[PDB]
């Protein structure tokens, strides 16, 4: 399966993401309004991927059109990128189970993690800027990339593209914030600590939202949603809770406390303290 994410305008970009979501996921019964929902990725065999053709980096022009991202469908991870001009698929080391037919696959030594990417890129995601201009730069860097080991510039490009494709697919918050960079004023999107926190809690959020039944709020670690519009405005797609995982430990997705749905692990993590006086004095 292949989809295009067209960066020409906010409309084309959002339309692109919505079309992907519609095809690969199913709205949660309890968090859906109109056709805007938190959707659960439909189950697919492991190894399944869909391709994303990057378009519109230069608004509405069939230029800079040789970049394709290979996305593992069950977790929305960018497994690597394809230079369609050289018919080469640069695949991260942790995605050797993703095979793409018809392209030359270059198995990389670099893995897909943000810890690795940020190191190699010498770029932290918190505060990372992404603009139409840097996506063009990112594109050029990936088209110029060669080799089995990510370079700083290719890593910066992957960080930027993963954010505006996979992370935006997962989080409507990032789709909303980033899309402003596509407008004619060409402002800069700056990834916030909150954006970063969301991405780091995707699996946890995924395990909790299917349990939502209209509670006043949802608390997942550092993440808080006070009402359904907050949920919808923040999250678009979650893992199928039937690399990111739905379970960290234990087997209880949630605990409802004072009409707030809490990730049980979060509550367990501040309810596991012994008596303060005994704690502090028992050095």
């Amino acid at each position: 399966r292949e989809f295009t994410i067209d960066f020409s305008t906010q409309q084309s970009y959002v339309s692109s993401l919505n079309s992907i979501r519609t095809e690969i996921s199913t709205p949660l019964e309890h968090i859906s309004q109109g056709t805007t929902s938190v959707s659960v990725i439909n189950h697919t065999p492991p190894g399944s991927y869909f391709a994303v053709d990057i378009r519109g980096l230069d608004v509405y022009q069939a230029r800079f059109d040789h970049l394709r991202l290979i996305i593992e469908q069950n977790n929305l991870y960018v497994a690597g990128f394809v230079n369609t001009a050289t018919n080469t698929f640069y695949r991260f080391s942790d995605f050797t189970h993703i095979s793409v037919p018809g392209v030359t696959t270059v198995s990389m030594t670099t893995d897909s993690s943000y810890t690795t990417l940020q190191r190699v890129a010498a770029l932290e995601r918190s505060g990372m800027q992404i603009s139409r201009h840097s996506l063009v730069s990112s594109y050029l860097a990936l088209m110029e990339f060669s080799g089995n080991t990510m370079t700083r510039d290719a890593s910066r490009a992957v960080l930027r593209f993963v954010t505006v494709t996979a992370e935006a697919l997962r989080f409507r918050q990032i789709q909303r914030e980033f899309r402003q960079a596509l407008s004619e004023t060409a402002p800069v999107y700056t990834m916030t600590p909150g954006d970063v926190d969301l991405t780091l809690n995707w699996g946890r959020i995924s395990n909790v939202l299917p349990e939502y039944r209209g509670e006043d709020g949802v608390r997942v670690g550092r993440i808080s949603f006070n009402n359904i519009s907050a949920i919808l405005g923040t999250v678009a797609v979650i893992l199928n809770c039937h690399q990111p995982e739905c379970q960290i430990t234990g087997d209880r997705p949630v605990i409802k406390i004072n009409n707030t749905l809490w990730e049980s692990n979060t509550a367990a993590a501040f309810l596991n303290r012994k008596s303060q006086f005994l704690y502090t004095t028992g050095k």
Partner: protein, 70 residues
């Protein structure tokens, strides 16, 4: 004896550093400090607690309590 079994209706830290919980309509207090976080946690997560004590007078002390998620 099982003095009371049910959800904790309210808990309360007392001026004498004891801790009170109301379960199934009756209040019991304990002087065991580590029961404070244990009981608050049970109250917050909805655990059924079974207060046990040789004597079960209302407003009586206890130092044995079973915790069940259900």
């Amino acid at each position: 004896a099982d003095c009371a079994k049910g959800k904790i209706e309210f808990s309360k830290y007392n001026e004498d550093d004891t801790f009170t919980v109301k379960v199934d309509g009756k209040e019991y207090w304990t002087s065991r400090w580590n029961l404070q976080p244990l009981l608050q946690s049970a109250q917050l997560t909805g655990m059924t607690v079974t207060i046990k004590s040789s004597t079960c007078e209302s407003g009586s002390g206890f130092a044995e309590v079973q915790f069940n998620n259900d």
